[PDB]
Design a protein. Structure first.
Lengths: 17, 17
């Protein structure tokens, strides 16, 4: 739940949410 | 793992994303 959240958080900030 | 995180997810998806 910390690294799968971190990958989703970067995914948003990649295509800025 | 995240009902407060889900309330932030709905609050963003409404005004943020």
């Amino acid at each position: 739940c910390g690294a799968e959240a971190a990958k989703a958080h970067a995914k948003a900030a990649e295509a800025g949410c």
